[PDB]
Amino acid sequence: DLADLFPGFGSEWINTSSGRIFARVGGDGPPLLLLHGFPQTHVMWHRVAPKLAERFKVIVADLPGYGWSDMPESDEQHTPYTKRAMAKQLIEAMEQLGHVHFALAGHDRGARVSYRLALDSPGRLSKLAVLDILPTYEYWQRMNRAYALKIYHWSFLAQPAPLPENLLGGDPDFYVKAKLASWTRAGDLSAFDPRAVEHYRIAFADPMRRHVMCEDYRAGAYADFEHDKIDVEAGNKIPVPMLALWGASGIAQSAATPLDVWRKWASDVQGAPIESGHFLPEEAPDQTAEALVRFFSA
Amino acid sequence: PDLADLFPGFGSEWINTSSGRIFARVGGDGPPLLLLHGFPQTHVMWHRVAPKLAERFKVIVADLPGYGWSDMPESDEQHTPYTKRAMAKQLIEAMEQLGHVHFALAGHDRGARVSYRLALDSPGRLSKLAVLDILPTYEYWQRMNRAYALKIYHWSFLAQPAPLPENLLGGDPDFYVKAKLASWTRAGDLSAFDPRAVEHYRIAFADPMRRHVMCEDYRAGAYADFEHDKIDVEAGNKIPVPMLALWGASGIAQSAATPLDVWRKWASDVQGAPIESGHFLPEEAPDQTAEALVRFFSAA
């Protein structure tokens, strides 16, 4: 009993070498891949994807390991849940749809896949939008007392298995609801469609899914950081035109001024705050959809 | 579920204070020496060194306020009872109930945070101070980087507002306490611990009220404790009590440290010695820890 939050969108299970990507597909026009983050699934886009779908071929994918996407078995370097590996798998997924050049909008973890995709394979991207993130490198580099308290989960979920898994397994409902609520402007679940929450909660109820998220965060503490580190110390900037959007009360703005930071990572970045917490497309759907439509359109 | 008396010869004292009772095992005679445990332990963590100290001292092995069998004072929005300043004042009162207004103090982990805060707040209470495998709380936070945030993640995790840490710790409390114990040893397993000691730790950690107190401790450690430490750094206040800083070669002090170098910024007279041990010096390396403590404290 999970609601269909994308009425009239198709359903694709896209085979890749690293497992199937699930995706809702709707609209027509240039291809726009939408990527969710933690602790969500592709359904987080349900309030903005229909507006995008009047303009673009919208592909709302579950991340590798998330939602209904297959979970590749991780390893000691958390390789398939590195953003590099996730980006490559999603590139593969898009190629299976005939999409070798596409627009990309990512939120949270999916935004981390997105900018890593833009660094690793910029030729795959027409335009990039990242929602309420700074590069992983920048979070760790700004990880002082205040910020370590603010995003403790970056260090907690990165603890070696099975420590976060075992703590999360006692009452997974509480944690997924806690993280959803804590990062919203309001600080509760009012911003979210209850049917969306059920998708997130059900995905989080699966211990393998939770393990994937921890592996995602372990990758985020280790390989992802190291990959970002190489690029920023090499002066490798994202050449793809990109939009950095962030919630005024979101997470990105807690570490630093997001546009300043992204200008260090991207030679063609525009930015705009939106009055929202972290979950821009659900807390601020119209404003997010308008900002994305405007930026991806000509 | 029966435990184990790991201090044969020692008495058992519930010390009344204005914030609740402090449990302590008391043995030996001579100059008073208070032994303070840390997280996630109880007084019984001293069971392998306290006999050797009891050869020369009246050894008071106390459960920290809110820990073990000590009473748990009601907390507040500022976690005041579990700030190290309030814990030190409560232990000062405990010690006063025994006639000890001037004592030696060895602290480990949280108890060492109590102990150096006690030395900053009430240095006249202490003849000599020994802290085991800590740097000041201010230092941990000021050194907070990616590497530190990952290694001492629990400093930020347990400091999250209630009931997030409590609800998660509830998910598998037995695992968590054992993982903390094992992950901070040199061996990486429970093999350094007396299983009777581990059972003490597991049973205390099994109580949600006890786990709450521990989070209250770390919440203080992220806020009030850090602020209190900050006032001293910025005022140049140094610990004047003769200090010994022991740390494990593989412990939670050496990482971003040379702990003696850090501690010299905090104390005018501090000696230091690495101990071949992880974080749990009195259990991983009892003879070495006891010898260093005995050598440092033997005078008075």
Side-chain angles (χ1 to χ4, degrees):
Chain A
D1 287 302
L2 276 180
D4 175 18
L5 300 178
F6 297 84
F9 278 55
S11 280
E12 289 254 70
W13 259 280
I14 302 146
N15 289 307
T16 78
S17 64
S18 289
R20 292 170 302 151
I21 294 307
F22 181 78
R24 297 306 291 277
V25 192
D28 71 278
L32 177 44
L33 178 60
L34 299 184
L35 300 173
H36 67 95
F38 169 93
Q40 307 193 289
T41 67
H42 71 276
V43 304
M44 69 156 284
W45 296 100
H46 75 107
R47 275 161 180 162
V48 310
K51 296 188 179 301
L52 297 176
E54 336 179 321
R55 275 278 311 110
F56 305 94
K57 171 66 55 174
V58 176
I59 299 112
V60 202
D62 283 335
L63 290 173
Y66 283 80
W68 297 344
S69 283
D70 288 332
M71 303 158 274
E73 179 170 312
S74 199
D75 52 48
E76 212 185 329
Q77 312 196 260
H78 326 290
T79 300
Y81 299 108
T82 63
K83 308 313 162 289
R84 171 159 294 161
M86 282 182 180
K88 294 190 177 153
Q89 179 177 2
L90 282 163
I91 284 162
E92 234 193 294
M94 292 309 276
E95 279 203 352
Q96 287 294 119
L97 312 185
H99 300 136
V100 300
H101 198 68
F102 50 88
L104 183 50
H107 177 254
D108 187 82
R109 314 312 290 183
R112 309 190 173 278
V113 170
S114 296
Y115 81 81
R116 173 49 52 195
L117 204 158
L119 284 162
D120 283 357
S121 311
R124 298 291 174 158
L125 297 185
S126 53
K127 284 195 178 188
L128 172 87
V130 291
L131 271 63
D132 207 46
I133 64 148
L134 309 173
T136 290
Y137 172 85
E138 295 289 346
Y139 278 33
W140 291 115
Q141 285 297 130
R142 291 178 161 74
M143 191 75 60
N144 60 14
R145 167 175 161 277
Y147 204 37
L149 293 169
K150 184 133 283 281
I151 53 161
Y152 81 94
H153 62 292
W154 272 52
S155 311
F156 168 61
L157 298 172
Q159 293 307 304
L163 174 132
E165 287 91 348
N166 281 354
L167 295 203
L168 290 177
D171 195 354
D173 283 1
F174 159 80
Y175 195 74
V176 65
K177 291 190 287 185
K179 298 301 116 186
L180 290 171
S182 55
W183 302 335
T184 61
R185 180 161 17 96
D188 54 21
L189 297 190
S190 53
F192 304 99
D193 191 302
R195 305 163 298 153
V197 188
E198 192 61 27
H199 272 267
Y200 314 148
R201 186 191 80 61
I202 278 186
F204 201 81
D206 184 329
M208 287 167 69
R209 296 294 165 180
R210 296 194 297 267
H211 174 62
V212 161
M213 301 168 202
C214 295
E215 287 298 299
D216 178 354
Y217 273 86
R218 287 171 192 123
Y222 292 102
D224 288 345
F225 171 79
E226 300 297 340
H227 298 166
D228 283 13
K229 180 178 169 302
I230 284 305
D231 285 317
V232 59
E233 294 175 341
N236 292 337
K237 291 202 194 196
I238 291 155
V240 178
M242 59 166 287
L243 172 71
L245 294 177
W246 65 90
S249 71
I251 302 166
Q253 61 87 30
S254 298
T257 310
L259 199 45
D260 295 330
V261 174
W262 276 112
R263 288 204 206 90
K264 170 185 136 176
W265 287 79
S267 47
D268 182 12
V269 51
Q270 42 181 297
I274 302 195
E275 257 340 294
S276 165
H278 181 69
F279 299 98
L280 278 54
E282 297 165 286
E283 307 184 55
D286 309 322
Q287 316 91 283
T288 299
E290 184 193 343
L292 295 176
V293 163
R294 182 70 274 130
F295 168 80
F296 288 129
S297 285
Chain B
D2 226 6
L3 277 301
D5 186 8
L6 294 180
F7 299 85
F10 287 60
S12 294
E13 180 85 26
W14 302 84
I15 308 180
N16 265 250
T17 73
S18 51
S19 306
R21 291 172 308 155
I22 297 307
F23 179 79
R25 299 303 296 280
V26 179
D29 57 277
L33 164 54
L34 179 59
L35 294 186
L36 296 190
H37 71 89
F39 173 91
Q41 295 191 291
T42 67
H43 69 275
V44 316
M45 63 148 278
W46 297 102
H47 76 107
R48 275 169 169 152
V49 308
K52 293 82 192 196
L53 297 174
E55 277 180 21
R56 329 262 288 254
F57 303 97
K58 183 194 168 164
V59 177
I60 301 98
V61 197
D63 284 336
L64 287 179
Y67 281 85
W69 301 336
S70 287
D71 284 341
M72 297 167 283
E74 185 128 9
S75 207
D76 62 38
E77 309 76 36
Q78 284 87 325
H79 328 291
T80 309
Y82 302 104
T83 67
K84 302 317 154 289
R85 165 160 295 147
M87 302 189 60
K89 282 197 288 200
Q90 175 171 4
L91 291 159
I92 288 174
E93 183 178 344
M95 291 298 269
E96 276 202 2
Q97 292 290 307
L98 302 190
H100 309 319
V101 304
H102 187 75
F103 45 96
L105 180 48
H108 175 255
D109 191 89
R110 312 314 285 179
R113 320 208 162 270
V114 183
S115 296
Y116 81 82
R117 166 51 52 203
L118 201 157
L120 283 162
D121 281 3
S122 301
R125 297 281 173 168
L126 301 182
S127 57
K128 293 212 199 52
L129 163 80
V131 289
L132 277 65
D133 206 55
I134 61 144
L135 311 176
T137 289
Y138 178 89
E139 301 289 340
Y140 281 29
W141 286 121
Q142 281 298 131
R143 316 197 174 298
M144 191 45 103
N145 52 28
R146 159 171 171 270
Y148 213 39
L150 295 168
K151 197 56 101 172
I152 58 151
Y153 82 97
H154 64 290
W155 275 53
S156 54
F157 171 58
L158 302 165
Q160 291 310 296
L164 191 143
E166 286 92 340
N167 282 5
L168 285 190
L169 295 186
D172 201 345
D174 272 15
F175 166 79
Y176 189 79
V177 63
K178 293 200 277 228
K180 295 306 109 191
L181 293 181
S183 59
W184 301 340
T185 57
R186 206 173 179 104
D189 60 18
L190 297 176
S191 71
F193 302 101
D194 195 307
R196 303 168 288 162
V198 164
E199 285 304 319
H200 274 264
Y201 315 143
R202 195 191 68 52
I203 295 207
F205 208 81
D207 190 325
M209 300 186 315
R210 296 284 162 185
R211 294 198 300 273
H212 176 58
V213 159
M214 305 175 190
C215 300
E216 285 299 291
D217 185 345
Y218 280 84
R219 286 174 186 125
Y223 294 99
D225 289 343
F226 172 77
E227 289 306 331
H228 296 162
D229 279 23
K230 191 173 188 277
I231 299 293
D232 290 313
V233 179
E234 306 201 319
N237 293 338
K238 298 216 183 304
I239 291 170
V241 188
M243 264 205 61
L244 178 62
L246 300 184
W247 64 94
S250 318
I252 315 174
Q254 196 275 344
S255 62
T258 38
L260 187 69
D261 291 340
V262 177
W263 272 111
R264 287 182 176 182
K265 293 184 288 265
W266 278 83
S268 41
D269 176 15
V270 48
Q271 323 162 211
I275 292 290
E276 292 275 33
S277 159
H279 178 52
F280 300 98
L281 274 63
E283 303 165 286
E284 302 182 64
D287 311 303
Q288 302 87 345
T289 300
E291 187 55 39
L293 291 177
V294 168
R295 154 171 53 203
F296 175 68
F297 284 128
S298 280

mmCIF file of all heavy atoms in Angstrom, chain A residues 141-175:
data_model
loop_
_atom_site.group_PDB
_atom_site.id
_atom_site.type_symbol
_atom_site.label_atom_id
_atom_site.label_comp_id
_atom_site.label_asym_id
_atom_site.label_seq_id
_atom_site.Cartn_x
_atom_site.Cartn_y
_atom_site.Cartn_z
ATOM 1 N N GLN A 141 35.547 19.819 5.638
ATOM 2 C CA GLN A 141 36.529 20.860 5.899
ATOM 3 C C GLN A 141 36.006 21.925 6.846
ATOM 4 O O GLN A 141 36.809 22.610 7.491
ATOM 5 C CB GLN A 141 36.971 21.485 4.582
ATOM 6 C CG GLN A 141 37.894 20.565 3.824
ATOM 7 C CD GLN A 141 39.182 20.302 4.571
ATOM 8 O OE1 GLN A 141 39.605 19.154 4.740
ATOM 9 N NE2 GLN A 141 39.814 21.373 5.030
ATOM 10 N N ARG A 142 34.687 22.075 6.948
ATOM 11 C CA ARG A 142 34.068 23.010 7.876
ATOM 12 C C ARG A 142 33.547 22.321 9.126
ATOM 13 O O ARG A 142 32.728 22.897 9.847
ATOM 14 C CB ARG A 142 32.937 23.756 7.176
ATOM 15 C CG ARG A 142 33.458 24.685 6.127
ATOM 16 C CD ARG A 142 32.353 25.400 5.376
ATOM 17 N NE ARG A 142 32.897 26.575 4.715
ATOM 18 C CZ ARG A 142 33.662 26.529 3.633
ATOM 19 N NH1 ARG A 142 33.960 25.360 3.086
ATOM 20 N NH2 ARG A 142 34.130 27.650 3.101
ATOM 21 N N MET A 143 34.010 21.100 9.397
ATOM 22 C CA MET A 143 33.441 20.277 10.466
ATOM 23 C C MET A 143 34.055 20.677 11.806
ATOM 24 O O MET A 143 34.892 19.981 12.385
ATOM 25 C CB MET A 143 33.657 18.796 10.186
ATOM 26 C CG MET A 143 32.859 17.902 11.126
ATOM 27 S SD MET A 143 31.121 17.897 10.684
ATOM 28 C CE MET A 143 31.205 17.253 9.011
ATOM 29 N N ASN A 144 33.631 21.839 12.293
ATOM 30 C CA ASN A 144 34.022 22.285 13.621
ATOM 31 C C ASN A 144 32.965 21.838 14.630
ATOM 32 O O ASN A 144 32.075 21.046 14.317
ATOM 33 C CB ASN A 144 34.238 23.799 13.636
ATOM 34 C CG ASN A 144 32.997 24.575 13.249
ATOM 35 O OD1 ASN A 144 31.893 24.035 13.211
ATOM 36 N ND2 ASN A 144 33.174 25.856 12.951
ATOM 37 N N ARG A 145 33.040 22.372 15.851
ATOM 38 C CA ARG A 145 32.133 21.940 16.908
ATOM 39 C C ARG A 145 30.678 22.172 16.522
ATOM 40 O O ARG A 145 29.851 21.250 16.569
ATOM 41 C CB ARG A 145 32.469 22.684 18.194
ATOM 42 C CG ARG A 145 31.415 22.556 19.255
ATOM 43 C CD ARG A 145 31.863 23.207 20.554
ATOM 44 N NE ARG A 145 30.716 23.483 21.405
ATOM 45 C CZ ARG A 145 29.948 24.562 21.292
ATOM 46 N NH1 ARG A 145 30.200 25.463 20.353
ATOM 47 N NH2 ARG A 145 28.916 24.724 22.105
ATOM 48 N N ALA A 146 30.351 23.408 16.137
ATOM 49 C CA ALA A 146 28.983 23.742 15.763
ATOM 50 C C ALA A 146 28.477 22.819 14.668
ATOM 51 O O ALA A 146 27.375 22.269 14.758
ATOM 52 C CB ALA A 146 28.910 25.201 15.306
ATOM 53 N N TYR A 147 29.277 22.629 13.621
ATOM 54 C CA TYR A 147 28.782 21.872 12.487
ATOM 55 C C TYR A 147 28.786 20.378 12.755
ATOM 56 O O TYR A 147 27.887 19.675 12.286
ATOM 57 C CB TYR A 147 29.592 22.200 11.237
ATOM 58 C CG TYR A 147 28.795 21.933 9.996
ATOM 59 C CD1 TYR A 147 27.431 22.196 9.967
ATOM 60 C CD2 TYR A 147 29.385 21.388 8.868
ATOM 61 C CE1 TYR A 147 26.679 21.946 8.841
ATOM 62 C CE2 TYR A 147 28.643 21.141 7.731
ATOM 63 C CZ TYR A 147 27.293 21.413 7.727
ATOM 64 O OH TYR A 147 26.558 21.163 6.598
ATOM 65 N N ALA A 148 29.764 19.883 13.520
ATOM 66 C CA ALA A 148 29.741 18.483 13.935
ATOM 67 C C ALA A 148 28.481 18.171 14.727
ATOM 68 O O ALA A 148 27.887 17.101 14.568
ATOM 69 C CB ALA A 148 30.986 18.152 14.750
ATOM 70 N N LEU A 149 28.049 19.098 15.578
ATOM 71 C CA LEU A 149 26.764 18.931 16.249
ATOM 72 C C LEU A 149 25.603 19.017 15.262
ATOM 73 O O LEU A 149 24.639 18.248 15.358
ATOM 74 C CB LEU A 149 26.618 19.981 17.342
ATOM 75 C CG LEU A 149 27.598 19.811 18.504
ATOM 76 C CD1 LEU A 149 27.561 21.041 19.398
ATOM 77 C CD2 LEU A 149 27.280 18.542 19.287
ATOM 78 N N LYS A 150 25.677 19.945 14.303
ATOM 79 C CA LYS A 150 24.564 20.139 13.378
ATOM 80 C C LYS A 150 24.359 18.919 12.483
ATOM 81 O O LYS A 150 23.235 18.438 12.322
ATOM 82 C CB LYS A 150 24.793 21.387 12.528
ATOM 83 C CG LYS A 150 23.631 21.699 11.614
ATOM 84 C CD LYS A 150 23.259 23.167 11.706
ATOM 85 C CE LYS A 150 22.483 23.453 12.985
ATOM 86 N NZ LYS A 150 21.038 23.067 12.896
ATOM 87 N N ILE A 151 25.430 18.413 11.884
ATOM 88 C CA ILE A 151 25.339 17.225 11.045
ATOM 89 C C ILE A 151 26.129 16.093 11.683
ATOM 90 O O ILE A 151 27.026 15.503 11.062
ATOM 91 C CB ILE A 151 25.819 17.506 9.611
ATOM 92 C CG1 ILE A 151 27.213 18.122 9.605
ATOM 93 C CG2 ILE A 151 24.825 18.393 8.894
ATOM 94 C CD1 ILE A 151 27.873 17.981 8.273
ATOM 95 N N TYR A 152 25.797 15.787 12.938
ATOM 96 C CA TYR A 152 26.377 14.625 13.598
ATOM 97 C C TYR A 152 26.201 13.363 12.766
ATOM 98 O O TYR A 152 27.036 12.455 12.830
ATOM 99 C CB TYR A 152 25.721 14.433 14.963
ATOM 100 C CG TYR A 152 24.406 13.739 14.786
ATOM 101 C CD1 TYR A 152 24.306 12.354 14.901
ATOM 102 C CD2 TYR A 152 23.277 14.454 14.410
ATOM 103 C CE1 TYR A 152 23.119 11.713 14.685
ATOM 104 C CE2 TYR A 152 22.079 13.818 14.201
ATOM 105 C CZ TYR A 152 22.012 12.450 14.333
ATOM 106 O OH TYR A 152 20.825 11.808 14.126
ATOM 107 N N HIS A 153 25.100 13.268 12.009
ATOM 108 C CA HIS A 153 24.813 12.037 11.287
ATOM 109 C C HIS A 153 25.880 11.748 10.250
ATOM 110 O O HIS A 153 26.085 10.589 9.893
ATOM 111 C CB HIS A 153 23.420 12.091 10.634
ATOM 112 C CG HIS A 153 23.253 13.165 9.609
ATOM 113 N ND1 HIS A 153 23.253 14.508 9.924
ATOM 114 C CD2 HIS A 153 23.037 13.093 8.271
ATOM 115 C CE1 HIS A 153 23.074 15.218 8.821
ATOM 116 N NE2 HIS A 153 22.939 14.382 7.804
ATOM 117 N N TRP A 154 26.590 12.774 9.791
ATOM 118 C CA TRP A 154 27.673 12.552 8.848
ATOM 119 C C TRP A 154 28.772 11.704 9.466
ATOM 120 O O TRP A 154 29.374 10.866 8.790
ATOM 121 C CB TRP A 154 28.214 13.895 8.376
ATOM 122 C CG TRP A 154 27.465 14.368 7.214
ATOM 123 C CD1 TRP A 154 26.108 14.480 7.100
ATOM 124 C CD2 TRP A 154 28.008 14.733 5.957
ATOM 125 N NE1 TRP A 154 25.775 14.924 5.847
ATOM 126 C CE2 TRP A 154 26.925 15.081 5.121
ATOM 127 C CE3 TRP A 154 29.308 14.808 5.449
ATOM 128 C CZ2 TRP A 154 27.103 15.497 3.808
ATOM 129 C CZ3 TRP A 154 29.480 15.232 4.147
ATOM 130 C CH2 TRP A 154 28.385 15.565 3.340
ATOM 131 N N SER A 155 29.037 11.902 10.754
ATOM 132 C CA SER A 155 30.014 11.103 11.473
ATOM 133 C C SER A 155 29.402 9.859 12.088
ATOM 134 O O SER A 155 30.093 8.838 12.227
ATOM 135 C CB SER A 155 30.662 11.942 12.581
ATOM 136 O OG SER A 155 31.100 13.190 12.069
ATOM 137 N N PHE A 156 28.130 9.927 12.476
ATOM 138 C CA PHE A 156 27.491 8.785 13.119
ATOM 139 C C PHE A 156 27.241 7.670 12.118
ATOM 140 O O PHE A 156 27.652 6.525 12.331
ATOM 141 C CB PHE A 156 26.177 9.210 13.771
ATOM 142 C CG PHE A 156 25.332 8.050 14.207
ATOM 143 C CD1 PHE A 156 25.807 7.155 15.155
ATOM 144 C CD2 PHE A 156 24.090 7.825 13.637
ATOM 145 C CE1 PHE A 156 25.043 6.077 15.560
ATOM 146 C CE2 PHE A 156 23.317 6.744 14.033
ATOM 147 C CZ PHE A 156 23.795 5.871 14.994
ATOM 148 N N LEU A 157 26.574 7.994 11.007
ATOM 149 C CA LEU A 157 26.265 6.997 9.993
ATOM 150 C C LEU A 157 27.502 6.485 9.282
ATOM 151 O O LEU A 157 27.419 5.466 8.588
ATOM 152 C CB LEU A 157 25.288 7.575 8.970
ATOM 153 C CG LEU A 157 23.947 7.989 9.559
ATOM 154 C CD1 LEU A 157 23.104 8.736 8.531
ATOM 155 C CD2 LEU A 157 23.212 6.761 10.067
ATOM 156 N N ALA A 158 28.631 7.171 9.424
ATOM 157 C CA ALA A 158 29.886 6.725 8.848
ATOM 158 C C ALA A 158 30.644 5.786 9.766
ATOM 159 O O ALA A 158 31.685 5.260 9.367
ATOM 160 C CB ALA A 158 30.769 7.928 8.517
ATOM 161 N N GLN A 159 30.165 5.577 10.988
ATOM 162 C CA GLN A 159 30.835 4.646 11.872
ATOM 163 C C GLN A 159 30.826 3.245 11.261
ATOM 164 O O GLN A 159 29.911 2.895 10.505
ATOM 165 C CB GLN A 159 30.156 4.646 13.234
ATOM 166 C CG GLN A 159 30.353 5.954 13.924
ATOM 167 C CD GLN A 159 31.817 6.311 13.985
ATOM 168 O OE1 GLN A 159 32.621 5.537 14.497
ATOM 169 N NE2 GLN A 159 32.175 7.478 13.468
ATOM 170 N N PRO A 160 31.841 2.436 11.557
ATOM 171 C CA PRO A 160 31.943 1.123 10.913
ATOM 172 C C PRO A 160 30.711 0.282 11.198
ATOM 173 O O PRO A 160 30.122 0.352 12.280
ATOM 174 C CB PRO A 160 33.202 0.511 11.540
ATOM 175 C CG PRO A 160 33.968 1.681 12.073
ATOM 176 C CD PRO A 160 32.940 2.664 12.515
ATOM 177 N N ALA A 161 30.302 -0.488 10.203
ATOM 178 C CA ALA A 161 29.196 -1.402 10.408
ATOM 179 C C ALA A 161 29.580 -2.424 11.477
ATOM 180 O O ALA A 161 30.753 -2.791 11.599
ATOM 181 C CB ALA A 161 28.832 -2.103 9.100
ATOM 182 N N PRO A 162 28.613 -2.904 12.265
ATOM 183 C CA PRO A 162 27.187 -2.597 12.182
ATOM 184 C C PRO A 162 26.710 -1.597 13.222
ATOM 185 O O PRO A 162 25.566 -1.716 13.654
ATOM 186 C CB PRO A 162 26.551 -3.944 12.458
ATOM 187 C CG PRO A 162 27.455 -4.493 13.562
ATOM 188 C CD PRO A 162 28.862 -3.984 13.238
ATOM 189 N N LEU A 163 27.557 -0.653 13.639
ATOM 190 C CA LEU A 163 27.174 0.191 14.773
ATOM 191 C C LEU A 163 25.975 1.073 14.443
ATOM 192 O O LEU A 163 24.965 1.007 15.166
ATOM 193 C CB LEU A 163 28.381 1.000 15.256
ATOM 194 C CG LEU A 163 28.066 2.032 16.342
ATOM 195 C CD1 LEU A 163 29.062 1.927 17.471
ATOM 196 C CD2 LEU A 163 28.063 3.433 15.788
ATOM 197 N N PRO A 164 25.989 1.895 13.393
ATOM 198 C CA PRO A 164 24.756 2.652 13.117
ATOM 199 C C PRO A 164 23.600 1.746 12.732
ATOM 200 O O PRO A 164 22.465 1.983 13.159
ATOM 201 C CB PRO A 164 25.166 3.594 11.983
ATOM 202 C CG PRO A 164 26.334 2.951 11.361
ATOM 203 C CD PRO A 164 27.052 2.212 12.421
ATOM 204 N N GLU A 165 23.865 0.692 11.958
ATOM 205 C CA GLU A 165 22.814 -0.258 11.606
ATOM 206 C C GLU A 165 22.118 -0.803 12.849
ATOM 207 O O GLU A 165 20.887 -0.887 12.907
ATOM 208 C CB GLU A 165 23.413 -1.400 10.785
ATOM 209 C CG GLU A 165 23.773 -1.003 9.357
ATOM 210 C CD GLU A 165 25.203 -0.497 9.209
ATOM 211 O OE1 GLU A 165 25.869 -0.232 10.233
ATOM 212 O OE2 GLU A 165 25.657 -0.336 8.057
ATOM 213 N N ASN A 166 22.899 -1.173 13.860
ATOM 214 C CA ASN A 166 22.314 -1.803 15.040
ATOM 215 C C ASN A 166 21.495 -0.811 15.853
ATOM 216 O O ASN A 166 20.442 -1.161 16.401
ATOM 217 C CB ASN A 166 23.413 -2.437 15.887
ATOM 218 C CG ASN A 166 23.874 -3.773 15.330
ATOM 219 O OD1 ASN A 166 23.299 -4.281 14.367
ATOM 220 N ND2 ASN A 166 24.910 -4.351 15.937
ATOM 221 N N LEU A 167 21.960 0.435 15.944
ATOM 222 C CA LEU A 167 21.183 1.449 16.641
ATOM 223 C C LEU A 167 19.941 1.829 15.849
ATOM 224 O O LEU A 167 18.866 2.031 16.426
ATOM 225 C CB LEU A 167 22.043 2.674 16.904
ATOM 226 C CG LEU A 167 23.220 2.471 17.855
ATOM 227 C CD1 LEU A 167 23.628 3.796 18.465
ATOM 228 C CD2 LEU A 167 22.883 1.459 18.936
ATOM 229 N N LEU A 168 20.072 1.941 14.526
ATOM 230 C CA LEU A 168 18.925 2.284 13.692
ATOM 231 C C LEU A 168 17.890 1.168 13.673
ATOM 232 O O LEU A 168 16.706 1.428 13.447
ATOM 233 C CB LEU A 168 19.378 2.591 12.266
ATOM 234 C CG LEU A 168 20.176 3.872 12.046
ATOM 235 C CD1 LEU A 168 20.621 4.022 10.589
ATOM 236 C CD2 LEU A 168 19.378 5.072 12.492
ATOM 237 N N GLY A 169 18.306 -0.075 13.903
ATOM 238 C CA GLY A 169 17.386 -1.189 13.783
ATOM 239 C C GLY A 169 16.364 -1.310 14.892
ATOM 240 O O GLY A 169 15.373 -2.023 14.720
ATOM 241 N N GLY A 170 16.555 -0.616 16.003
ATOM 242 C CA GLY A 170 15.628 -0.738 17.113
ATOM 243 C C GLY A 170 14.303 -0.055 16.849
ATOM 244 O O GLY A 170 13.234 -0.598 17.150
ATOM 245 N N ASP A 171 14.365 1.142 16.270
ATOM 246 C CA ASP A 171 13.169 1.921 15.952
ATOM 247 C C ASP A 171 13.449 2.746 14.702
ATOM 248 O O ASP A 171 13.637 3.963 14.767
ATOM 249 C CB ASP A 171 12.786 2.807 17.136
ATOM 250 C CG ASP A 171 11.385 3.368 17.024
ATOM 251 O OD1 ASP A 171 10.737 3.169 15.977
ATOM 252 O OD2 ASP A 171 10.929 4.011 17.987
ATOM 253 N N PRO A 172 13.496 2.100 13.529
ATOM 254 C CA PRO A 172 13.837 2.851 12.309
ATOM 255 C C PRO A 172 12.834 3.940 11.981
ATOM 256 O O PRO A 172 13.228 5.008 11.497
ATOM 257 C CB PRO A 172 13.883 1.763 11.227
ATOM 258 C CG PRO A 172 13.161 0.600 11.804
ATOM 259 C CD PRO A 172 13.340 0.660 13.272
ATOM 260 N N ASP A 173 11.546 3.694 12.226
ATOM 261 C CA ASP A 173 10.527 4.722 12.048
ATOM 262 C C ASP A 173 10.919 6.026 12.731
ATOM 263 O O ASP A 173 10.781 7.108 12.156
ATOM 264 C CB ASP A 173 9.192 4.237 12.615
ATOM 265 C CG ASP A 173 8.491 3.256 11.706
ATOM 266 O OD1 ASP A 173 9.037 2.929 10.634
ATOM 267 O OD2 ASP A 173 7.386 2.810 12.066
ATOM 268 N N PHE A 174 11.385 5.941 13.977
ATOM 269 C CA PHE A 174 11.716 7.158 14.714
ATOM 270 C C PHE A 174 12.782 7.958 13.986
ATOM 271 O O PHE A 174 12.666 9.179 13.836
ATOM 272 C CB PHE A 174 12.201 6.819 16.120
ATOM 273 C CG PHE A 174 13.013 7.914 16.742
ATOM 274 C CD1 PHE A 174 12.389 9.011 17.311
ATOM 275 C CD2 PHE A 174 14.395 7.873 16.716
ATOM 276 C CE1 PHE A 174 13.131 10.037 17.868
ATOM 277 C CE2 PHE A 174 15.143 8.895 17.266
ATOM 278 C CZ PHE A 174 14.511 9.979 17.842
ATOM 279 N N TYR A 175 13.836 7.281 13.531
ATOM 280 C CA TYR A 175 14.979 7.997 12.985
ATOM 281 C C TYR A 175 14.643 8.647 11.659
ATOM 282 O O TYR A 175 15.020 9.796 11.408
ATOM 283 C CB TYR A 175 16.164 7.061 12.805
ATOM 284 C CG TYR A 175 17.449 7.809 12.588
ATOM 285 C CD1 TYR A 175 18.076 8.466 13.645
ATOM 286 C CD2 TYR A 175 18.031 7.877 11.331
ATOM 287 C CE1 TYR A 175 19.245 9.156 13.459
ATOM 288 C CE2 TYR A 175 19.212 8.553 11.134
ATOM 289 C CZ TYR A 175 19.815 9.195 12.199
ATOM 290 O OH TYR A 175 20.990 9.882 12.030
#
